[model samples]
Target chain A: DATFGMGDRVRKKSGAAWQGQIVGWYCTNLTPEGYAVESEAHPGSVQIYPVAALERIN
Target chain B: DATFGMGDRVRKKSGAAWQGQIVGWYCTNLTPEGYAVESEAHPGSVQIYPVAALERIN
Candidate 1:
């Protein structure tokens, strides 16, 4: 079983604020290599992010 | 498949808001108690939460 990581609340570059939960984190031999963080809302959906772009809320 | 949990920002009891993300959640006998969440958005789709509902501008 995989454990989930709760993401910090963050404001979008568009100026919107969102409360998202970190679902997954990965690193691979890709172009922009780094921690790839995945999150979802309370309702259930998915969001992708680069580790550098993500900030812990709490 | 199982993996994902990024959630925080909360600004909707209802008022003047417009921003929706959370997509899925489940609470079963196997994992009863708290729930799960998800989110997704970019370039397309209608706004779920109304304005003033979200508050993350960064």
Candidate 2:
């Protein structure tokens, strides 16, 4: 049940336009609010947009 | 490592029942049997339910 790990292409929505293939998500379990998530993108890489912000291209 | 590809949904088994999103999976060499599978849902469009029958409704 652990699919879509690191190095996978993903997209996101931004304003009126959209960003494509932002970057692969990195698995992590660190967060002050305990909002741990698997295959999460790097913090500084891109905004932790909702999974809806993604549209897998590959 | 390779992540889920092609469509973004998956579900299996014919019992109790557990389904999710599956619309993208097209990466080969990612299966247990070493079967080349990458978003292969066009064959019958539903029987290929190994990783594309659930919901990623982010």
Candidate 3:
């Protein structure tokens, strides 16, 4: 487990274009594990991504 | 529909004592809608709550 915390900055490990801060974590039947990331520069544009797809940034 | 953004601080509307920031948003068969909340004071302690049960804080 990477131990992702709230408000932690992260970006796509593969895509590398989308980057944002971790805002919400969700798990359901549809999605086993996912996170809601909010863009810092662009507010109101929140996107969800898999835990493995995201990597923390400095 | 209440616009619940990521990283928003929230707490229980009725039963207080637990307060944390939104870290995840989930919707599944078991749970229609839920949020993963993490404590700022106590890291690593996260809990899930319904959207209506939580209210945003300043």
Once fitted onto the true fold, the runs of candidate 2 whose alpha carbons sit more than 4 angstroms away are A13-44, B1-58
**Judged by lDDT, which candidate is best?**
3
Candidate 3 per-residue lDDT over residues A1-58, each given as its tens digit: 4357778898988965678777667653344477777777776566677688888999
For candidate 1, write residues B1-58 as lDDT tens digits: 3232334433334443333343434555655422222223332222343222344322
TM-score of chain B of each: 0.21, 0.22, 0.78
Candidate 1 C-alpha error for residue B6, in Å? 29
* Shift of residue A19 alpha carbon in model 2, Å: 4.1
Per residue, candidate 1 scores C-alpha lDDT tens digits across A1-58 of 2233545444233433344556556655552422323223334444454554555554
Tens-digit lDDT track for model 2 on A9-43? 55543453333333322221221111112133333
lDDT of 3 by residue, B1-58 (tens): 4457667898888876567777767553334567777676777566666677888899
Residue A51 in candidate 3 has what lDDT?
Answer: 83
Tell me how each candidate scores on DockQ against the true complex. 0.04, 0.02, 0.16
